[PDB]
């Protein structure tokens, strides 16, 4: 009922605070972003909306780096997502100094988790309204994780969030099954691009510009790098071949 729509400092009978419900809703009200785990890595791709020719490519990429090997992409509202990441970064710098090792993807899930959860024990701090999909390669394997705005998070094999969440899970679930987990990292860029194409079909009021990045231990060597050039260009073509229209 009531008091739980303005606060988080008290507990709903539904077990789910009305303010928390509103936070999830703004996530589905953004853009599509997805994440693909594969047999050596992770590949991230996002739909970037084109509205006008007054915007500039690759300076409004929604992929932001943390550390060296974690690429972080989101759906929802821009300011929430950047502040959440800036906090990730600061914990990441601290981590690296103290333990002389890079920040894990599981660690980072926890770091984010505890900043969100903190703002969901307090009515005096307002939480985040983004779902952030992130991952990388570390000393203990490859990881894809998704952070949701409650302060719920888990590791996934595949993830989507946003407007195009459903269409993306469909197209992903077929491709992952077919493969053992998503085959090679090379293959995964082509696969990704198909997923974005299907996810675009829920927009159709804006054109899009395809942006992919990857983190791969067999074709990047453990670093997060963008996928551009030849590799992006073959990927646009693959999507437009099989998916027609």
């Amino acid at each position: 009922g009531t008091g739980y729509d303005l606060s988080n400092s008290v507990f709903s009978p539904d077990g789910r605070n009305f303010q928390v419900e509103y936070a999830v809703k703004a996530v589905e009200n953004g853009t599509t972003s997805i994440g693909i785990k594969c047999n050596d890595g992770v590949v991230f791709a996002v739909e970037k909306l084109i509205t006008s020719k007054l915007l500039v490519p690759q300076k409004n990429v929604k992929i932001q780096v943390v550390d060296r090997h974690i690429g972080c992409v989101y759906s929802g509202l821009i300011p929430d997502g950047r502040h959440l990441v800036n906090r990730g970064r600061e914990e990441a710098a601290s981590f690296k100094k103290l333990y002389k090792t890079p920040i894990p993807i599981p660690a980072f899930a926890d770091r984010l988790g505890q900043y969100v959860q903190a703002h969901t024990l307090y009515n005096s701090v307002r939480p985040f309204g983004v779902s952030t999909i992130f991952g990388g390669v570390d000393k203990n394997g490859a990881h894809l994780y998704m952070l949701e705005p409650s302060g719920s998070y888990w590791g996934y094999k595949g993830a989507a969030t946003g407007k195009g969440r459903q269409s993306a899970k469909a197209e992903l679930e077929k491709l992952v099954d077919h493969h053992p987990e998503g085959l090679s990292a090379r293959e995964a860029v082509k696969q990704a691009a198909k997923i974005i194409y299907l996810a675009h079909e829920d927009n159709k009021e804006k054109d899009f510009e395809l942006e992919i990045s990857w983190c791969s231990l067999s074709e990047t060597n453990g670093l997060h790098k963008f996928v551009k050039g030849d590799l992006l260009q073959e990927a646009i073509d693959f999507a437009q071949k099989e998916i027609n229209g």
């Binding site: 077990g15 988790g113 969100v116 959860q117 969901t120 994780y145 409650s150 302060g151 719920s152 998070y153 888990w154 590791g155 996934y156 094999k157 595949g158 993830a159 899970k169 992903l172 679930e173 992952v176 099954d177």
Partner: peptide, 28 residues
Amino acid sequence: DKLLDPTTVSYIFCISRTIGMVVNGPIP
């Protein structure tokens, strides 16, 4: 899901090497 890795899914935690804690209730 078939797309949610169920290893990370945890609700018995190992608090120490010897101690366990079973949580009934949500991951936040």
